[PDB]
């Protein structure tokens, strides 16, 4: 076949797939789906681990190009690729983050925000303003009494399956 670090069948396959995304809604939906399926520790699968970063970028290039052509200037600056009001989404997410009861709740909010609104879905200005606010709260909740929970209990909280231990 054709394997390789920077060029392989998987990447070619996605380039062809992306080439057929010719309307904003279809392309934007696929990018969002891709992020749910292949990014973050909560991805639905690790099958594209070695190529998802690169494929996501190529998918992003297409959504961006389609958005610029479909959106008027005001919407390109203030609406998400899905037609949502960026400010509303940002404020609502931040509000949710500030209500978070704990670091576990907070991490889900932040990570999901990225998966769903990362540019070119949400305009860069709003997204990084979100990163600014959500990240602060996430860290405040996480870095409090950071070492109190013993490794034995933390593993359980994270919910990992302890496969092998030695010491």
């Amino acid at each position: 076949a054709k394997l390789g670090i920077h060029s392989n069948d998987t990447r070619d396959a996605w380039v062809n797939k992306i080439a057929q995304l010719n309307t904003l809604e279809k392309a934007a939906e696929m990018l969002k789906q891709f992020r749910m399926d292949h990014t973050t520790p909560f991805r639905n699968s690790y099958e594209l681990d070695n190529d998802y970063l690169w494929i996501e970028a190529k998918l992003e290039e297409k959504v961006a190009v389609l958005k610029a052509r479909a959106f008027n200037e005001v919407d390109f600056r203030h609406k998400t690729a899905f037609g949502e009001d960026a400010k509303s989404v940002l404020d609502g997410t931040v509000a949710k983050m500030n209500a978070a009861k704990d670091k576990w709740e907070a991490e889900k909010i932040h990570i999901g925000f990225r998966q769903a609104y990362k540019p070119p879905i949400m305009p860069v200005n709003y997204f990084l303003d979100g990163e600014r606010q959500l990240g602060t709260r996430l860290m405040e909740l996480r870095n409090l009494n950071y070492y109190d929970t013993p490794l034995e209990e933390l593993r359980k909280q994270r919910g990992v399956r302890v496969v092998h231990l030695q010491s």
């Binding site: 670090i5 699968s45 860290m139 933390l154 399956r161 092998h164 231990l165 030695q166």
Partner: protein
């Protein structure tokens, strides 16, 4: 009507007033801390004066390099092993310098006091100079040295090996990804203060001893700028000491930063020093204890106690796992020599004595191993042997720490032999210590770096090397070598003949 002028200090007197208030005048980055807007900076510089003092240093530096040193053939009259060591030392430090540019740009953004922004600004500019300076060392050795390969393309050939991954953690991502304050700690309070500055001086020492007068010329000049960078690390702590958040998070971010930095340098620096040189300057063991334990984790860190700063809680473990760290790692680096961009050599007879002398027990463990690899013909291209094979035959799996990226072989190491394997949402993760494991468990999404075995899984060795341009200008001889002699250099074909195919060691687990 007498000759009058204005100096930097006279203008700097009013610099704090340059910033003004407005609703949105705030940092664009996420942070648990609040930097006091009254914070002052130590050096009263302005752009013009900063440029002049640096230009004066460049003058002397490039003057030496281009004239006297070149006339003396300084680029050549260096020990072969050290010519290779500098390919890694100069290029890896380069990325640290480079990322410190972005890191300090982020601190400049974080600071609200004009003077504190200015302090960080001077560092931004200094890290640009340092990047270019490290670049120049590789540039000079490639142009006038005994082996240009690696020195001439490290920026892309560095990507083949596993040692590069860890460098990015401590000197790239560690400098810019996270709370600005957390980054400041990794960079200035820990990174530069504990390792970088001491390292810079040490390198000029080992360099001079091995005939290299190029590096001292550049690095000694870099060193003159790092004095100011220390003040930036100190002022970071000062700017946040009076903030309630500080008591809550400072020591945690500091402890995490300390472990992060220590984890990679404790073994890597010692390895480049002791194994990357002919003439030794000092055993890594005592150098480490002085730097980390005495000077930093005692003297420097102590002076900050008045701001709530405490000694890293993980300092004890760090010391415990320190002793054999670098020795354990060279076994791996040499076993994986075909993945580097530099040539490595087995310890010679004299060296083994030094090693055994300075590290009781070294021979019975590492000494014997190298002798067998030697016997198996690891230096010979016709042997069809690569130390990696030995690890496979003797069932000694090499894992990559998901957090630090530092390679470890718990079944063989004389130092830390702890291995933690977790499965989470369909992915396996391998950790070598309790501090890194904690980091991943609490911040899974921060550490998703794929390791070389994951990326190279099922790939034949020669194909990876060829694809990532790991060859010399002849397009056949490998850049990396299992020996530093000038004859019998391995070729891509010698590697292909070995038919070495990578596999992800964690897959063995059920």
């Amino acid at each position: 009507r007498a000759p009058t002028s204005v100096n930097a200090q006279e203008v700097h007197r009013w610099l704090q007033s340059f910033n003004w208030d407005f609703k949105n005048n705030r940092t664009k980055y996420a942070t648990k801390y609040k930097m006091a807007n009254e914070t002052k900076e130590q050096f009263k510089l302005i752009a013009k004066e900063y440029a002049r003092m640096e230009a004066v240093k460049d003058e002397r530096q490039f003057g030496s390099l281009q004239d006297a040193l070149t006339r003396l053939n300084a680029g050549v009259r260096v020990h072969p092993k050290w010519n290779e060591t500098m390919k890694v030392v100069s290029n890896f430090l380069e990325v640290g310098e480079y990322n410190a540019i972005a890191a300090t740009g982020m601190l400049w953004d974080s600071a609200q006091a004009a003077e504190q922004k200015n302090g960080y600004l001077a560092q931004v500019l200094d890290e640009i100079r340092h990047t270019h300076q490290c670049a120049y060392v590789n540039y000079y050795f490639a142009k006038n040295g005994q082996d240009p390969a690696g020195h001439n393309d490290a920026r892309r050939t560095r990507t083949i090996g596993p040692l590069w991954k860890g460098m990015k953690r401590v000197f790239s991502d560690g400098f810019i990804s996270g709370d600005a304050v957390e980054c400041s700690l990794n960079l200035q309070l820990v990174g530069e203060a504990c390792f970088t500055n001491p390292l810079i001086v040490a390198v000029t020492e080992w360099a001079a001893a091995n005939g290299d007068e190029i590096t001292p010329t550049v690095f000694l000049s870099i060193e003159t700028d790092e004095l100011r960078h220390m003040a930036n690390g100190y002022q970071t702590v000062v700017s946040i000491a009076n903030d309630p958040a500080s008591a809550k998070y400072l020591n945690t971010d500091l402890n995490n930063a300390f472990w992060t930095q220590q984890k990679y340098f404790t073994p890597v620096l010692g390895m480049l020093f002791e194994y990357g040189s002919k003439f030794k300057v000092e055993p890594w063991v005592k150098t480490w204890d002085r730097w980390v334990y005495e000077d930093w984790g005692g003297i420097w860190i102590g002076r900050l106690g008045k701001y709530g700063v405490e000694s890293p809680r993980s300092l004890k473990d760090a010391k415990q796992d320190a002793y054999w760290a670098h020795h354990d790692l060279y076994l791996l680096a040499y076993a994986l020599w075909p993945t580097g961009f530099f040539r490595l050599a087995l310890p010679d007879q004299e060296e083994m004595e030094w090693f055994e002398a300075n590290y009781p027990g070294w021979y019975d463990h590492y000494g014997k191993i190298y002798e067998e690899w030697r016997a198996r013909g690891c230096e010979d291209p016709s042997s069809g042997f690569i130390p990696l094979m030995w690890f496979i035959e003797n069932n000694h799996p090499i894992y990559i720490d998901r957090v630090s990226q530092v390679p470890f072989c718990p079944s063989l190491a004389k130092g830390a032999s702890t291995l933690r394997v977790h499965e989470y949402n369909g992915e396996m993760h391998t950790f070598s210590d309790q501090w890194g494991e904690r980091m991943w468990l609490a911040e899974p999404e921060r550490y998703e770096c794929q390791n070389i075995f994951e990326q190279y899984e099922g790939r034949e060795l020669s194909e990876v090397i060829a694809e990532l341009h790991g060859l010399r200008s002849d397009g056949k001889t490998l850049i990396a070598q299992p020996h530093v002699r000038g004859d019998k250099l391995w070729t891509l074909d010698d590697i292909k003949r070995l038919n070495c195919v990578f596999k992800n060691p964690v897959k063995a687990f059920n």
